[PDB]
Design a protein around this ligand. Structure first.
Ligand SMILES: C[C@H](O)[C@@H](O)[C@@H](O)[C@H](O)C(=O)O
Ligand SMILES: [Cl-]
Ligand SMILES: [Cl-]
Length: 301
């Protein structure tokens, strides 16, 4: 039987993320002999991440890119895994995603209506592009940095001294052009693909978040599918995640040079003072289970 699945994301056509969605679509199409078809909706065509997630939860045949910081809204302990400067090594992160605590969380989420489809996308390392250079935390004072509607990211930027300004990625460009905000934070490929270099000419390599992304949909939808189809969807999704773990990194030199050609200065910074301020967020979540952060660090190594 033919199954169509809408795939919603904020990234624009040609971004590495969009390329990996094409990989996934082709992989799944081939495994299923054309019976399972992904319909791609880049550039926030289906609206905001939080809204798309709600539609999925009611049973719409849609998935969206997301992360554990968003999912913390539904399962609070997941928030710790989106914390700043957790590690610079993707391999360590993926140990937690592959471990039994994350499995338990993923099963909890199903009962809440949320089905993780792809658990292993390497989104990149999040940097900041801004209208004035950020070399020290002191430079962030007075700056309105856009962040997603993600509690951990909001608290992270507050702890470092900025004024976080949350909004969906699809609204960010005009806010930056108008000076409502004066910076944006994201992996360099996403910053470039969203054209923020037209409005901001300083890129600081704070590297505050080594970023894993998830594809998520609604359990009410996925539980209706036969086992053989679910297997093809999960396997092809995992393949795509593995592809992202090569492509995202491979794209680095190319993206650095494109930024330079657009007149953006790439700034290496002393990361330690940013990290020292950001680390305070780990004691700002009273709803976390006791010992959560310690357990996470123990699993990372
Ligand atoms: C995987 C993440 O949720 C991204 O989709 C999100 O950070 C996005 O790049 C944004 O900046 O809103
Ligand atoms: Cl949102
Ligand atoms: Cl958002």
């Amino acid at each position: 039987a033919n199954v169509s699945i809408k795939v919603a994301y904020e990234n624009n056509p040609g971004e590495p993320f969009d390329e990996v969605m094409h990989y996934w679509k082709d992989d799944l199409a081939k495994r299923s002999n054309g019976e399972i078809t992904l319909e791609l909706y880049p550039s926030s065509q289906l609206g905001s991440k939080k809204d798309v997630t709600e539609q999925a939860m009611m049973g719409l045949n849609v998935v969206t890119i997301s992360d554990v910081g968003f999912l913390a809204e539904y399962d609070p302990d997941l928030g710790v895994l989106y914390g700043p400067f957790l590690t610079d090594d993707p391999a360590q992160l993926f140990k937690v995603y592959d471990g039994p605590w994350f499995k338990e969380k993923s099963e909890e989420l199903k009962k809440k209506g949320i089905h993780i489809v792809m658990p292993n996308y390497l989104y990149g390392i999040r940097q900041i592009i801004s209208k004035k250079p950020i070399r020290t935390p002191e430079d962030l004072k007075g700056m309105k940095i856009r962040v997603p509607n993600n509690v951990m990211q909001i608290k992270t930027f507050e702890a470092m001294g900025a004024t976080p300004t949350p909004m969906p990625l699809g609204e960010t460009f005009p806010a930056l052009a108008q000076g409502v905000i004066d910076g944006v934070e994201n992996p360099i490929s996403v910053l470039y693909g969203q054209k923020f270099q037209e409005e901001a000419k300083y890129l600081s390599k704070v590297g505050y978040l080594t970023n894993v992304a998830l594809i998520v949909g609604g359990e009410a939808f996925f539980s209706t599918l036969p086992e053989d189809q679910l297997k093809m969807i999960h396997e092809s999704a995992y393949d795509a995640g593995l592809y992202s773990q090569k492509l995202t990194i491979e794209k680095d030199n190319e993206m650095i040079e494109k930024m330079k050609e657009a007149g953006v200065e790439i700034i290496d910074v002393d990361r330690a003072p940013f990290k020292a301020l950001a680390e305070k967020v780990y004691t700002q979540f009273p709803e976390w289970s006791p010992g959560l952060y310690d357990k996470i660090k123990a699993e990372l190594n």
